[PDB]
Amino acid sequence: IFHINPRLPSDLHPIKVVEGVKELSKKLVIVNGDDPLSRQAQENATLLFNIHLRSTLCSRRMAEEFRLSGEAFDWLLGEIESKFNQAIAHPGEMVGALAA
Amino acid sequence: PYANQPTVRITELTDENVKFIIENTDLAVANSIRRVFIAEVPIIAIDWVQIDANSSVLHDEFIAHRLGLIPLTSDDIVDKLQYSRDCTCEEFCPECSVEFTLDVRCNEDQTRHVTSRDLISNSPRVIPVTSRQDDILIVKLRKGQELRLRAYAKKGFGKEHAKWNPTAGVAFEYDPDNALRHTVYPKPEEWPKSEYSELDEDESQAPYDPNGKPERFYYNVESCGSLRPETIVLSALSGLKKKLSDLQTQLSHEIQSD
Amino acid sequence: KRITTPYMTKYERARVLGTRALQIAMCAPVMVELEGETDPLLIAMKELKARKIPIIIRRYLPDGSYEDWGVDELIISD
Amino acid sequence: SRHGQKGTCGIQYRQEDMPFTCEGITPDIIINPHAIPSRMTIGHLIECLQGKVSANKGEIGDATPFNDAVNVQKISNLLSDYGYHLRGNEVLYNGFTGRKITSQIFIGPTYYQRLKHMVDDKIHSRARGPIQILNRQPMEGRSRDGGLRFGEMERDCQIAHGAAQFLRERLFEASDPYQ
Amino acid sequence: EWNIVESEKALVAESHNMKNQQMDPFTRRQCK
Amino acid sequence: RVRGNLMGKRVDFSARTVITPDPNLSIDQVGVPRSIAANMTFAEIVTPF
Amino acid sequence: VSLMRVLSEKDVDPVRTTSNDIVEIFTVLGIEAVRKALERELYHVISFDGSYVNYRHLALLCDTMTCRGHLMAITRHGVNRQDTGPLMKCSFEETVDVL
Amino acid sequence: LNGLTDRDLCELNECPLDPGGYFIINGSEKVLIAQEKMATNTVYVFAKKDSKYAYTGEC
Amino acid sequence: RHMCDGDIVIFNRQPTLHKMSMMGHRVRILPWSTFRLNLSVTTPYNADFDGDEMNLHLPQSLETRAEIQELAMVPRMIVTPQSNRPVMGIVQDTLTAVRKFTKRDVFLERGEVMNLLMFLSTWDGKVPQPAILKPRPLWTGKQIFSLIIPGHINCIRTHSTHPDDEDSGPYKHISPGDTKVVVENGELIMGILCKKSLGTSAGSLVHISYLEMGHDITRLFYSNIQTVINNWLLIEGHTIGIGDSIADSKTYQDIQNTIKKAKQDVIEVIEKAHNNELEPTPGNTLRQTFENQVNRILNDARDKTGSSAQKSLSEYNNFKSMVVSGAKGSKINISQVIAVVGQQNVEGKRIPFGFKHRTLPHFIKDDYGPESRGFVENSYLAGLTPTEFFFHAMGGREGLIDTAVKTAETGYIQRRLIKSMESVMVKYDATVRNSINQVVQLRYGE
Amino acid sequence: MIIPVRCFTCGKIVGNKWEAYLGLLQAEYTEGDALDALGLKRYCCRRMLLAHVDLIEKLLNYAPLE
Amino acid sequence: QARAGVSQVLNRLTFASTLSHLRRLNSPIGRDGKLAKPRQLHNTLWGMVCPAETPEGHA
Amino acid sequence: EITPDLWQEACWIVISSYFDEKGLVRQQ
Amino acid sequence: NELIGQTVRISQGPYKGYIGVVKDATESTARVELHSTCQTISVDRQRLTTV
Amino acid sequence: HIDQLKEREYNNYSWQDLVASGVVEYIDTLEEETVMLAMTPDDLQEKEVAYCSTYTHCEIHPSMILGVCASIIPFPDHNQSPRNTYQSAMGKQAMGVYITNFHVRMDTLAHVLYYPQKPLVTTRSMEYLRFRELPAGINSIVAIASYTGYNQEDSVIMNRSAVDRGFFRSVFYRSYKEQ
Amino acid sequence: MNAPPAFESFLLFEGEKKITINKDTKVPNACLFTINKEDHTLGNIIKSQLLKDPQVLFAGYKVPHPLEHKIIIRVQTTPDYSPQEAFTNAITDLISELSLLEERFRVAIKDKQEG
Amino acid sequence: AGILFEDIFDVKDIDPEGKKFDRVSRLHCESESFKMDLILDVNIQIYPVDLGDKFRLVIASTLYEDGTLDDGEYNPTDDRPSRADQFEYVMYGKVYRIEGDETSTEAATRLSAYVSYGGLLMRLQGDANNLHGFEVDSRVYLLMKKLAF
RNA sequence: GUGUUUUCCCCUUGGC
Ligand SMILES: [Mg+2]
Ligand SMILES: [Zn+2]
Ligand SMILES: [Zn+2]
């Protein structure tokens, strides 16, 4: 979309990757709340996706493999959160009928 | 930016079929002509059957159906008659139909064959083909069985019902040697030569002709006898030209009315 | 202190659209400009996109509490 | 057909629209190739081939099963003598445009059956017809002008949908509305 | 009757050689 | 009652026919025969629209 | 199957040895080990043919079957024992008996 | 219809190809379907698992 | 008012096995007397036009119309939650044709492109620059298909024939056989499409189309594929015939030699068993050892012959084309049609001795040889010997029995589950509880 | 039952050939030479006469009267 | 308490149906009997009973 | 003398004679 | 109504010459049960003539 | 025996003379336990490297294992067996002429085909089934092509113009009885 | 039973227009001609005659549904050329073609006779 | 200008893998002044070539000799000076990969520019300085022409 | 101007 050309040196600062992913981990909320029991369960419920997110959006893979610009990275983070929030189970979903 | 100049050669012309070749022209024109031969040349066929007495072993719809398929010698009168849907008269009239009568009773032991020879027209020019060989069998009757009915034939397209299709089979072929490779034989040697193949018996198919176009179209228009086989073609060209003229009229009205 | 999801679930969207389209069909005043359509479901859908549907959604929690959510407050998904 | 190929007429094309060989032989029935490969009704293909031989040869072919006097290669040899492709394929021309179809089509006489299952004996509809006397629900069956059963499994499929309004209408307001 | 004549002449025509093909267009068991 | 008359019911405004292919419909379209359509009705509230 | 005695054997691996028998595992390893075992057996039957089903539906089934701390059979004997309420049990089996 | 010629069967409005082998009961052609059964008078030895018997010589 | 064009109906096939069996459809009124539906949609319903009948339900209210329209409309049902993959693919002859179409050597004149573009609904009206300009302007099947792919999808797939040793060597990104489907910016750059890329597999191009673009744009995608490709297939055509089932005489000689060796090998294993020279495999009885040996020999025979058959088929062979598209059939069907039908099992075993110590009166007592126990050595083109015709019937009866039997129990299996789990749902607490409100899962699926 | 008036596939009148066909067979023309002599070239026309079963001759065995 | 359907209305639909209805055998074994072995094509039906003509339904 | 192959003709003169003697429903 | 249950001929339009029985008729249109086809058409009553 | 039986009726020889000449024998499934049964003479009794050389009996023709509806299938040995079963099913539904006195029958349901035809390829067995006298079906010029796709999942495209000519046109008789 | 009558393939209903031009919006100088009660016979010859026009950038025809008797012909020309006159000249010259072919056929008939 | 690359070439193999397609063959070719390498698929049906065929290959950014960028839509009806007018085989395609021997520290010495001509693939491989005109996802024209020599 | 009615159980067969 932003026509990266992974052959020129990129302008995406490494710590903008680090802190962008940190901030993104905040917006992918499964268990809402500030209670310790709820921060714990939010951390558990989004633990594998957060590991995946931190393992593909690394400072290095962004530098050496994806070569995303800053604009591309901002877009990327917004896309990740906008898609994750669509993945959340809708309340009201007759999931046991689905399981059967 | 304009039309091509088609040209024609008749290679054979019988009272059953025409073989002819159209050159130049275009594949779409040649195929649409083929279609008009099949589906939009008008002929006269039985399309109304008032059965007064039937005691044959065939039920009335079966009799009526068979009468439908009997071809009629409408070589001229089809261009005179209106479509009945368009004629302004409350019943059938001799200007939009030909009446037929069938009145046969098997008053003898020998199994009477009712045939097209028993369809009596009200018009000596619209008669079943086999009346002008053997006649088309409509029913075999046992002693004491009878079939009295009167029918009307009317003009119709082969497009409406197949009874009005004038052709027995339109052969249509182009590029007999596959120079265009529009067909792509997996094994070009298993395929016999076309009737019109120009190749020797050595080579299988013509060398690919990249800039080529399909430009000779080989026809065999076999009639069912309802029209003479050359009249099928002339009538299809007239019909297609008339369809296009009508389309153009409606177009000009839609353009000027915008 | 509403704790439920701020997104209009697809069930709430189906029910809200059908209910609002019913109200429109019963000659309720429309909350959006009609550019010239007449189906009550198309109008209800436009109102949903304009976030002008005059309906609030009472979401019951399993404890039997409830939360009321306008149809302009929560984030419509499709 | 005699080989357990079965199918509803999916459309009817006039002779002008059906594809045609060099002569104006249009098929009567065009069946999709995908009927064959999963079902391996190769008896169907061999019937079509030997039927095309029989119709040219001008007498009825033998298809008695275990007759080693018959084989596909022997039929193909005969078929090639009448000036057809030995495997029954033909060049067809598209009825719409007249262009040759690039794939040659397997075409030939095959014995089809028409089964008692006609569609007009099956088409059925209801919109507030007769009602049972005991439980005031639609009668059962086409002959009775009944309503289709919205069964258990449909109930489950609509729960999974979460389509409670359409579940209420099907299992109540469009069946036995009462007070 | 003419079919019986045609069958008996075809039967003596079954005596002709090379009327079968080596490309295994059919196979028959012959064990032991 | 529970199963044959309550959990499942015969329903008004239903139709059954042989299905036939139609590659010219969208995946979300069903082509239905005019006699069925002329039988089954939809109650549509009247509005100045 | 004799799972407890087998697990007790020296040189048997007591961490990995498993029973292909959800009832045996219940008595030996308890309801949560039953949840895991049942989930793995069910996944085994489903995936054996190469097909795939989301884990949500397996976890949900195995959870309903283990939600009350015993193996809740999916039968009249199992789901009508659950205290769901009479109008739901009559919809299933024992219709008038539960009523 | 026994041994009756095709001419006569046609005169009876019967079909000479019709096989026979069915009854007419109140106007309905009723065929008796041949019902399969175990042969009588013949000993058979079966093992019936899920029973106290290792073997059972039925007759 | 009467039902009319655009009305929303639920449409059902009465084995209502899963959620996608009652999808909502818009009505189009058409002349003849049938329901008509588009053939990507048969797979959800498990429908086939063999004479299937389907139930239409006309929701009677705005509240239920809108509910169906927003919850059940077919495009909303493309990706199933059961396996998180599309339930609808491109199917049947559209899938064969799209494989053929996207080959590398498919070239279309402007008269055929501009005719195909008439059948694209989403085409922006701009004719793409042909892949080849000078000689005559020729487009490419992938270049036309690049217009069908909506938006800017990106996906990579391997065509079914992709040789696995191709990603290792050179040519990794420039594939000799035009396997390796690459879509980039919604542009088919490389690769033949097949079921692997247009079918129902996870990560198929229609899956990416659903996750990336809407359900509406994916709906247009399925429609445009069927509508362009079926109108190109009026040019290309596709068939199947006897020529597609014959193989080369050298291939038949190889097949027959392979079977002869396999028969001889089975005879030698029998000799080894008869002499008690056959040492049992551990755990197996000597009989189980013998049966395993014979089944291995005869499976290897059927497999080697099936391969030699497939290796003979030209790129033109219409079994091959339906198989490698995934449209219908499989390599074992090609094998059975060309090479050898193979062992006929009943209950997983070879044909049982239903006569005293023999399968049929034509065989000798204790004839364990291959044909004596159901090994059909002919192909469906060769025809079956009468004995192996009867064994084939015995074997194919198993499938008819299990068809019937699978019906009854499995549906019972399937009601009990639903009654056990009907009211389990996801609450606004975002926790998964049941009717009585006992918490089953704290979060849906953890 | 009776001979079809037209060959279903193409359209050629075959309904005036059945009695001729049988008469040529009674001249002991071979079965395809009868068709070659009537003028049926396409196998689609030939299967009209080869395949036709003339059941009306059996239906006429039944008497309505006499 | 008796056997049922021993005597069925002759299938006049088509002559091969009439002929086959007259030549039809029937096992009394219970349908809804889940056993496969009485439904399997036994080796001993060779030449006695058609290996191919069976109802694909529950029977 | 014995049937020197050419046996298909003989094989269906038998059978044909059977069904002459015992039409298809003889068992009823 | 005065013209229900009578045998009528369609004298105009596409169905010219079809014979059928009027199963129903408003002042504007009859419904004519066509004798030949398995179909009942609705036809503008001026198109009909009693036979 | 063959010569005598060929002139049968003219010499009033019969099958009963084949039985009463110790030439053919009724074997039954329990005696079939103990026959050694060749399958044709030229196959099984010729001096190959002997299989058994002790045949007591020989199959008369192996296709006689088929029943009435299965022996109308041509080349059934070239089909997958479930498909021969499906034909044995559907062959009991093919419209034809079901009996020649059908004009006298007041059957509740009868379907009579207008132009039923004799199959262009037959088993010999369907001679005795009398299928060429009361046939159920039409030999049609089938083409196995995908064409327009309306034949796709187990469907057929028919020729409309063939139907216009009476292709598979049938009549349906329903008899209503009241006293 | 709920069968269209066969005349519906070629007879216009009261109020149906034969042809109904519609300016296309996606690109300049493009129209869609919707012919009613026509098929590939009249639509394919027009399409292929339009492709002989060098001033016609795009020309094609489709039949949206075979059970419906209606074709759509989309023509795009160069800005100095409306597709209205492209379609008009594609019919004028195609009529000139068929009429010349008819005359040449009529003469070729009576020239095969005694020639 | 928009002439990205040009050299003398000759075909040195065709379909080394065997002929995978009927109207398309792999050409394996070598350059002569730069001794770069080329793997090109040509429509071998309308433009046949043989081993040892020498040709000019001018990969260009645009056809127009004034170098004005095209919009990438096919139009005909155009007078404008076009490079194609002096070639024999012209293709249009999307550069879809540029591989090279990049190390972690110092740049690639050689690049392989991969181009897809509507699905007909090309790989041009050689010293990077001749491939600097290629960037991934850019439109290019092949414009090759056989040297009669 | 008067107008939609009106059976069941049981068995068998058949359709996907
Ligand atoms: Mg089906
Ligand atoms: Zn008049
Ligand atoms: Zn014909």
mmCIF file with all atom_site columns, C-alpha atoms in Angstrom, chain B residues 38-119:
data_model
loop_
_atom_site.group_PDB
_atom_site.id
_atom_site.type_symbol
_atom_site.label_atom_id
_atom_site.label_alt_id
_atom_site.label_comp_id
_atom_site.label_asym_id
_atom_site.label_entity_id
_atom_site.label_seq_id
_atom_site.pdbx_PDB_ins_code
_atom_site.Cartn_x
_atom_site.Cartn_y
_atom_site.Cartn_z
_atom_site.occupancy
_atom_site.B_iso_or_equiv
_atom_site.pdbx_formal_charge
_atom_site.auth_seq_id
_atom_site.auth_comp_id
_atom_site.auth_asym_id
_atom_site.auth_atom_id
_atom_site.pdbx_PDB_model_num
ATOM 1  C CA . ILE B 1 38  ? -32.476 -22.909 -37.998 1.00 0.00 ? 38  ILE B CA 1
ATOM 2  C CA . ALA B 1 39  ? -34.677 -20.619 -35.974 1.00 0.00 ? 39  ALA B CA 1
ATOM 3  C CA . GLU B 1 40  ? -35.995 -17.523 -37.775 1.00 0.00 ? 40  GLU B CA 1
ATOM 4  C CA . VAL B 1 41  ? -36.911 -18.511 -41.321 1.00 0.00 ? 41  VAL B CA 1
ATOM 5  C CA . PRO B 1 42  ? -40.734 -18.696 -41.360 1.00 0.00 ? 42  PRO B CA 1
ATOM 6  C CA . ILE B 1 43  ? -42.649 -21.679 -42.686 1.00 0.00 ? 43  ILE B CA 1
ATOM 7  C CA . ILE B 1 44  ? -46.252 -22.870 -42.516 1.00 0.00 ? 44  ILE B CA 1
ATOM 8  C CA . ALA B 1 45  ? -46.997 -25.674 -40.067 1.00 0.00 ? 45  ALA B CA 1
ATOM 9  C CA . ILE B 1 46  ? -50.112 -27.054 -38.418 1.00 0.00 ? 46  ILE B CA 1
ATOM 10 C CA . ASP B 1 47  ? -50.666 -25.096 -35.231 1.00 0.00 ? 47  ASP B CA 1
ATOM 11 C CA . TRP B 1 48  ? -54.382 -25.479 -34.479 1.00 0.00 ? 48  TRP B CA 1
ATOM 12 C CA . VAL B 1 49  ? -56.235 -28.791 -34.373 1.00 0.00 ? 49  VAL B CA 1
ATOM 13 C CA . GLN B 1 50  ? -59.943 -29.141 -33.580 1.00 0.00 ? 50  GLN B CA 1
ATOM 14 C CA . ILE B 1 51  ? -60.498 -32.870 -33.150 1.00 0.00 ? 51  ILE B CA 1
ATOM 15 C CA . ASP B 1 52  ? -64.131 -33.793 -33.769 1.00 0.00 ? 52  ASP B CA 1
ATOM 16 C CA . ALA B 1 53  ? -63.882 -37.579 -33.566 1.00 0.00 ? 53  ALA B CA 1
ATOM 17 C CA . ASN B 1 54  ? -60.803 -39.572 -32.626 1.00 0.00 ? 54  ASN B CA 1
ATOM 18 C CA . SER B 1 55  ? -60.898 -43.254 -31.737 1.00 0.00 ? 55  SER B CA 1
ATOM 19 C CA . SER B 1 56  ? -57.416 -44.181 -32.883 1.00 0.00 ? 56  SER B CA 1
ATOM 20 C CA . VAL B 1 57  ? -55.136 -45.802 -30.338 1.00 0.00 ? 57  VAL B CA 1
ATOM 21 C CA . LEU B 1 58  ? -53.348 -42.443 -29.990 1.00 0.00 ? 58  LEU B CA 1
ATOM 22 C CA . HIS B 1 59  ? -54.795 -39.752 -27.757 1.00 0.00 ? 59  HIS B CA 1
ATOM 23 C CA . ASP B 1 60  ? -55.677 -36.397 -29.252 1.00 0.00 ? 60  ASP B CA 1
ATOM 24 C CA . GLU B 1 61  ? -52.587 -34.499 -28.113 1.00 0.00 ? 61  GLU B CA 1
ATOM 25 C CA . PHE B 1 62  ? -50.509 -37.193 -29.788 1.00 0.00 ? 62  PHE B CA 1
ATOM 26 C CA . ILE B 1 63  ? -52.438 -36.847 -33.050 1.00 0.00 ? 63  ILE B CA 1
ATOM 27 C CA . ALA B 1 64  ? -52.231 -33.070 -32.837 1.00 0.00 ? 64  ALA B CA 1
ATOM 28 C CA . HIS B 1 65  ? -48.513 -33.186 -32.121 1.00 0.00 ? 65  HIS B CA 1
ATOM 29 C CA . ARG B 1 66  ? -47.883 -35.423 -35.112 1.00 0.00 ? 66  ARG B CA 1
ATOM 30 C CA . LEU B 1 67  ? -49.891 -33.115 -37.357 1.00 0.00 ? 67  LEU B CA 1
ATOM 31 C CA . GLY B 1 68  ? -47.741 -30.242 -36.140 1.00 0.00 ? 68  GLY B CA 1
ATOM 32 C CA . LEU B 1 69  ? -44.562 -31.914 -37.357 1.00 0.00 ? 69  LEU B CA 1
ATOM 33 C CA . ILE B 1 70  ? -45.885 -32.611 -40.873 1.00 0.00 ? 70  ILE B CA 1
ATOM 34 C CA . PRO B 1 71  ? -44.030 -30.176 -43.164 1.00 0.00 ? 71  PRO B CA 1
ATOM 35 C CA . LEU B 1 72  ? -46.056 -28.085 -45.597 1.00 0.00 ? 72  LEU B CA 1
ATOM 36 C CA . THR B 1 73  ? -44.968 -26.856 -49.031 1.00 0.00 ? 73  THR B CA 1
ATOM 37 C CA . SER B 1 74  ? -45.058 -23.179 -48.054 1.00 0.00 ? 74  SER B CA 1
ATOM 38 C CA . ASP B 1 75  ? -42.351 -22.268 -50.573 1.00 0.00 ? 75  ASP B CA 1
ATOM 39 C CA . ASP B 1 76  ? -44.197 -19.068 -51.560 1.00 0.00 ? 76  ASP B CA 1
ATOM 40 C CA . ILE B 1 77  ? -47.285 -18.489 -49.434 1.00 0.00 ? 77  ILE B CA 1
ATOM 41 C CA . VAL B 1 78  ? -45.279 -18.087 -46.214 1.00 0.00 ? 78  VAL B CA 1
ATOM 42 C CA . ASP B 1 79  ? -44.048 -14.744 -47.524 1.00 0.00 ? 79  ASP B CA 1
ATOM 43 C CA . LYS B 1 80  ? -47.663 -13.691 -48.186 1.00 0.00 ? 80  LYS B CA 1
ATOM 44 C CA . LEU B 1 81  ? -49.406 -14.711 -44.980 1.00 0.00 ? 81  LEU B CA 1
ATOM 45 C CA . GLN B 1 82  ? -49.450 -12.634 -41.838 1.00 0.00 ? 82  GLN B CA 1
ATOM 46 C CA . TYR B 1 83  ? -48.635 -14.059 -38.480 1.00 0.00 ? 83  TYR B CA 1
ATOM 47 C CA . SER B 1 84  ? -52.020 -14.883 -37.011 1.00 0.00 ? 84  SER B CA 1
ATOM 48 C CA . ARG B 1 85  ? -51.092 -12.934 -33.890 1.00 0.00 ? 85  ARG B CA 1
ATOM 49 C CA . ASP B 1 86  ? -50.912 -9.924  -36.221 1.00 0.00 ? 86  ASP B CA 1
ATOM 50 C CA . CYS B 1 87  ? -53.895 -10.545 -38.499 1.00 0.00 ? 87  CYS B CA 1
ATOM 51 C CA . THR B 1 88  ? -56.997 -8.472  -37.746 1.00 0.00 ? 88  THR B CA 1
ATOM 52 C CA . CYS B 1 89  ? -59.760 -11.055 -37.936 1.00 0.00 ? 89  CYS B CA 1
ATOM 53 C CA . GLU B 1 90  ? -61.642 -12.823 -35.158 1.00 0.00 ? 90  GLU B CA 1
ATOM 54 C CA . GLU B 1 91  ? -60.968 -16.379 -36.380 1.00 0.00 ? 91  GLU B CA 1
ATOM 55 C CA . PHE B 1 92  ? -58.566 -17.866 -38.882 1.00 0.00 ? 92  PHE B CA 1
ATOM 56 C CA . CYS B 1 93  ? -58.865 -16.489 -42.407 1.00 0.00 ? 93  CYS B CA 1
ATOM 57 C CA . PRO B 1 94  ? -57.169 -17.481 -45.670 1.00 0.00 ? 94  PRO B CA 1
ATOM 58 C CA . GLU B 1 95  ? -54.964 -14.401 -45.356 1.00 0.00 ? 95  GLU B CA 1
ATOM 59 C CA . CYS B 1 96  ? -53.383 -15.625 -42.104 1.00 0.00 ? 96  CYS B CA 1
ATOM 60 C CA . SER B 1 97  ? -53.826 -19.414 -42.210 1.00 0.00 ? 97  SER B CA 1
ATOM 61 C CA . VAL B 1 98  ? -54.431 -22.481 -44.329 1.00 0.00 ? 98  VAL B CA 1
ATOM 62 C CA . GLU B 1 99  ? -57.249 -24.753 -43.224 1.00 0.00 ? 99  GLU B CA 1
ATOM 63 C CA . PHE B 1 100 ? -56.721 -28.506 -43.282 1.00 0.00 ? 100 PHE B CA 1
ATOM 64 C CA . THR B 1 101 ? -59.254 -31.291 -42.933 1.00 0.00 ? 101 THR B CA 1
ATOM 65 C CA . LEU B 1 102 ? -58.684 -34.927 -42.053 1.00 0.00 ? 102 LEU B CA 1
ATOM 66 C CA . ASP B 1 103 ? -61.695 -37.257 -42.316 1.00 0.00 ? 103 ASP B CA 1
ATOM 67 C CA . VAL B 1 104 ? -60.767 -40.948 -42.252 1.00 0.00 ? 104 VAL B CA 1
ATOM 68 C CA . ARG B 1 105 ? -62.592 -44.015 -40.952 1.00 0.00 ? 105 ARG B CA 1
ATOM 69 C CA . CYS B 1 106 ? -61.250 -47.569 -41.194 1.00 0.00 ? 106 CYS B CA 1
ATOM 70 C CA . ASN B 1 107 ? -64.324 -49.391 -42.507 1.00 0.00 ? 107 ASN B CA 1
ATOM 71 C CA . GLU B 1 108 ? -62.269 -52.385 -43.694 1.00 0.00 ? 108 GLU B CA 1
ATOM 72 C CA . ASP B 1 109 ? -60.307 -55.222 -42.132 1.00 0.00 ? 109 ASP B CA 1
ATOM 73 C CA . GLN B 1 110 ? -56.915 -54.121 -43.449 1.00 0.00 ? 110 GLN B CA 1
ATOM 74 C CA . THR B 1 111 ? -55.214 -51.736 -41.039 1.00 0.00 ? 111 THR B CA 1
ATOM 75 C CA . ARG B 1 112 ? -55.843 -48.299 -42.513 1.00 0.00 ? 112 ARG B CA 1
ATOM 76 C CA . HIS B 1 113 ? -52.809 -46.024 -42.511 1.00 0.00 ? 113 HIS B CA 1
ATOM 77 C CA . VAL B 1 114 ? -53.834 -42.417 -42.037 1.00 0.00 ? 114 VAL B CA 1
ATOM 78 C CA . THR B 1 115 ? -51.140 -40.365 -43.739 1.00 0.00 ? 115 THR B CA 1
ATOM 79 C CA . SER B 1 116 ? -50.421 -36.823 -44.824 1.00 0.00 ? 116 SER B CA 1
ATOM 80 C CA . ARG B 1 117 ? -52.102 -37.923 -48.044 1.00 0.00 ? 117 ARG B CA 1
ATOM 81 C CA . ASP B 1 118 ? -55.349 -37.570 -46.047 1.00 0.00 ? 118 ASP B CA 1
ATOM 82 C CA . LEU B 1 119 ? -54.726 -33.969 -44.954 1.00 0.00 ? 119 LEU B CA 1
#
